[PDB]
Amino acid sequence: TNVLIEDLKWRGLIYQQTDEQGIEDLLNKEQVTLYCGADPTADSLHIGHLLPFLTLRRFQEHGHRPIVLIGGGTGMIGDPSGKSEERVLQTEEQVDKNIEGISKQMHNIFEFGTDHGAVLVNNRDWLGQISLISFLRDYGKHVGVNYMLGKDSIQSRLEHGISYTEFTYTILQAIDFGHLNRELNCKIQVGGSDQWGNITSGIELMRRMYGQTDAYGLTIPLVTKSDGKKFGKSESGAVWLDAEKTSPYEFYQFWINQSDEDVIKFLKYFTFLGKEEIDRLEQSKNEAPHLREAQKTLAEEVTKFIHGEDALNDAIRIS
Amino acid sequence: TNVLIEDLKWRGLIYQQTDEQGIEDLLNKEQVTLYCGADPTADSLHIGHLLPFLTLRRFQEHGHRPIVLIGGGTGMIGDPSGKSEERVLQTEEQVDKNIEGISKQMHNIFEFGTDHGAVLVNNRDWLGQISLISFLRDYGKHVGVNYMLGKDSIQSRLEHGISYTEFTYTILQAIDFGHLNRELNCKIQVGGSDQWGNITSGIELMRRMYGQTDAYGLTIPLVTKSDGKKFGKSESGAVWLDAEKTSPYEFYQFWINQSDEDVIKFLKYFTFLGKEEIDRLEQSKNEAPHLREAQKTLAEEVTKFIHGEDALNDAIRIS
Ligand SMILES: CCCCOC(=O)[C@@H](NC(=O)[C@@H](N)Cc1ccc(O)cc1)[C@H]1[C@H](O)[C@](O)(CO)[C@@H](O)CN1O
Ligand SMILES: CCCCOC(=O)[C@@H](NC(=O)[C@@H](N)Cc1ccc(O)cc1)[C@H]1[C@H](O)[C@](O)(CO)[C@@H](O)CN1O
Numbered sequence: 112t113n114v115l116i117e118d119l120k121w122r123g124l125i126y127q128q129t130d131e132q133g134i135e136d137l138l139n140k141e142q143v144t145l146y147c148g149a150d151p152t153a154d155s156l157h158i159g160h161l162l163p164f165l166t167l168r169r170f171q172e173h174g175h176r177p178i179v180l181i182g183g184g185t186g187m188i189g190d191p192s193g194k195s196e197e198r199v200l201q202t203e204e205q206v207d208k209n210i211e212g213i214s215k216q217m218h219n220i221f222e223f224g225t226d227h228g229a230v231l232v233n234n235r236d237w238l239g240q241i242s243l244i245s246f247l248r249d250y251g252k253h254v255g256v257n258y259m260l261g262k263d264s265i266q267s268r269l270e271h272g273i274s275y276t277e278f279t280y281t282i283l284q285a286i287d288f289g290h291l292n293r294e295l296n297c298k299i300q301v302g303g304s305d306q307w308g309n310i311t312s313g314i315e316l317m318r319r320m321y322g323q324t325d326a327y328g329l330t331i332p333l334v335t336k337s338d339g340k341k342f343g344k345s346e347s348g349a350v351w352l353d354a355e356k357t358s359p360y361e362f363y364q365f366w367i368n369q370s371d372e373d374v375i376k377f378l379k380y381f382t383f384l385g386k387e388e389i390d391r392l393e394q395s396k397n398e399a400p401h402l403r404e405a406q407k408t409l410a411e412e413v414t415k416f417i418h419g420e421d422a423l424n425d426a427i428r429i430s
Numbered sequence: 431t432n433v434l435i436e437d438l439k440w441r442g443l444i445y446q447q448t449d450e451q452g453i454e455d456l457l458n459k460e461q462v463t464l465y466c467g468a469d470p471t472a473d474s475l476h477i478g479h480l481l482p483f484l485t486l487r488r489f490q491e492h493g494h495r496p497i498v499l500i501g502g503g504t505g506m507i508g509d510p511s512g513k514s515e516e517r518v519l520q521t522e523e524q525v526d527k528n529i530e531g532i533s534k535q536m537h538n539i540f541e542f543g544t545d546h547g548a549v550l551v552n553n554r555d556w557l558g559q560i561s562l563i564s565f566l567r568d569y570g571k572h573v574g575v576n577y578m579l580g581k582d583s584i585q586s587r588l589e590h591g592i593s594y595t596e597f598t599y600t601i602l603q604a605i606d607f608g609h610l611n612r613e614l615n616c617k618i619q620v621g622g623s624d625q626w627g628n629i630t631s632g633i634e635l636m637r638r639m640y641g642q643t644d645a646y647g648l649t650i651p652l653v654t655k656s657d658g659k660k661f662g663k664s665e666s667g668a669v670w671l672d673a674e675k676t677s678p679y680e681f682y683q684f685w686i687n688q689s690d691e692d693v694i695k696f697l698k699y700f701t702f703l704g705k706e707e708i709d710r711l712e713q714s715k716n717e718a719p720h721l722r723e724a725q726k727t728l729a730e731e732v733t734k735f736i737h738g739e740d741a742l743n744d745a746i747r748i749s
Pocket of ligand 1: 147148149150151152153154155157159160161163164180182185192213234283284287288301302303304305306309326
């Protein structure tokens with residue numbers, strides 16, 4: 112008992128939390144249904160999107176039920192979290208195709224189709240049925256302009272030009288939690304630091320709309336390189352999870368090129384090894400460095416999980 | 431041994447780190463001189479500036495030497511970290527007065543004047559002696575435009591209008607670390623999440639300029655309210671550390687009004703109590719809630735540390 116929460120802590124997968132007791136107690140006392148979402152604004156994800164999802168798997172292992180949410184509806188708008196300029200809105204077509212690429216990739220990381228395992232939902236399924244008058248009276252009435260204002264993620268765009276569309280996004284992600292909380296009994300939402308605004312926007316709606324249903328929110332750290340240069344984007348560009356964009360070999364290199372300063376942490380972040388296994392690697396790392404042992408294992412271990420062992424080999428095959 | 435680092439972990443005062451082994455080993459093996467800086471752009475600090483400084487005290491206790499850095503020179507420019515618009519530059523006079531107010535307040539949190547205790551420096555003392563040709567050849571030569579570009583903290587302002595002045599700031603904070611590393615043997619810099627860009631900008635200069643001198647950088651978390659509303663600013667405004675701006679009573683209220691969801695964490699963050707003391711308070715908190723016991727202690731405990739016990743009383747005196 113208390114094993115999962117301890118692991119997430121040892122590996123450092125936790126940054127922010129709405130209620131630390133409530134969560135610990137919940138994660139101990141029962142089986143949680145939690146969810147993380149992705150707006151389809153690319154037909155592929157890059158390594159910068161992996162940690163939060165990988166982390167839903169971790170929750171699954173201990174017997175919880177994950178929800179991968181795909182934003183058909185919200186991806187039509189644009190999430191302004193962490194932004195400076197207007198996210199130009201794309202066509203009902205570009206979304207439709209992106210959603211096709213991304214949805215594919217979630218299927219390689221989770222096992223959909225079981226009777227009670229991982230679920231994959233699309234928010235357009237419910238936001239597409241809600242109207243302007245229906246929205247303003249059923250949900251909008253329960254959101255305060257003062258709460259929304261001052262919210263961290265708004266100031267950024269507040270000083271420049273935040274449209275009503277871009278401004279109205281959180282309420283859109285606040286209804287998803289409420290819906291999902293209601294229909295699939297979703298009690299926790301995981302996301303990265305940028306989502307802290309939209310996560311809490313949701314717990315509060317639920318609270319005012321109808322007594323918060325043991326709903327909680329927690330965030331995952333920002334993958335930081337030791338030299339402060341942004342992780343994931345080299346120069347050629349982002350390291351995509353699609354072989355047609357970043358070959359498994361190019362994908363395998365990225366990893367092996369990791370610095371000793373952050374190789375072990377990357378190991379705790381992206382691989383399902385184990386304390387003594389990871390400590391095994393730590394010792395050899397800081398003792399026979401020329402062996403690049405820890406980089407080697409991370410590379411292989413994360414390339415198997417994404418491109419199958421069969422490409423992992425074709426991740427060394429060319430010379 | 432390994433006590434300090436363990437405490438900072440139990441209370442959660444750590445977010446980002448450049449080299450986690452190197453730090454642990456350093457914090458174990460010897461006595462560290464570390465520093466955190468403040469640009470004088472206000473004649474007072476508000477509770478949002480307190481955690482990082484409070485945290486230098488924590489390091490002192492275990493026998494390390496803190497450096498409170500005041501930016502007379504840099505505060506003339508403006509730090510664009512975490513910004514969207516141009517930080518208009520203020521007059522050589524406004525700086526001069528702000529520096530007078532803030533400097534006062536650092537003196538109430540640390541004990542300056544000892545022969546080998548806490549040091550208070552001013553960067554104008556050294557940046558004021560460096561010229562344009564001297565700068566470009568001695569330090570500028572060692573900074574790469576590609577490193578600087580893509581640096582997280584730049585993108586924000588990159589999409590809008592980042593001047594050369596505003597763009598050139600990090601190199602200014604990179605020389606401070608190098609200088610201080612050289613003269614007072616400074617090996618670690620603490621700052622909040624926004625400073626991760628400027629911290630690492632400094633370890634890298636040092637590295638290229640002359641083999642990194644066991645220099646490391648670590649950051650402190652972002653104080654988050656459970657409802658996602660920004661901590662420190664109510665509506666009337668920020669809760670200042672100056673009684674002439676926020677009375678000790680108004681200061682004491684702010685604290686007592688803290689929610690049960692984050693009272694214990696606030697306790698681990700802002701007070702020098704102790705594990706069993708804080709656990710004592712946790713139990714009563716989640717068992718006899720009407721007693722507001724944990725809010726009560728935090729209020730008193732943080733009001734003594736800032737306004738003296740003599741105002742702590744005058745923090746309840748009016749009715
Ligand atoms: C692959 C294309 C990327 C599309 O999605 C994202 O970029 C991030 N998500 C968002 O913006 C959210 N408003 C999406 C959302 C949609 C509806 C909801 O009901 C809840 C959340 C992801 C980030 O990419 C992330 O890094 C991992 O995917 C982490 O920040 C968690 N986020 O949810
Ligand atoms: C009281 C007026 C506030 C003035 O300072 C700040 O606001 C923050 N500091 C900065 O901007 C830095 N470029 C300052 C600096 C100056 C020269 C250096 O060589 C290194 C750093 C503080 C923040 O306020 C903070 O929240 C705590 O003070 C935390 O982010 C740590 N920071 O250094």
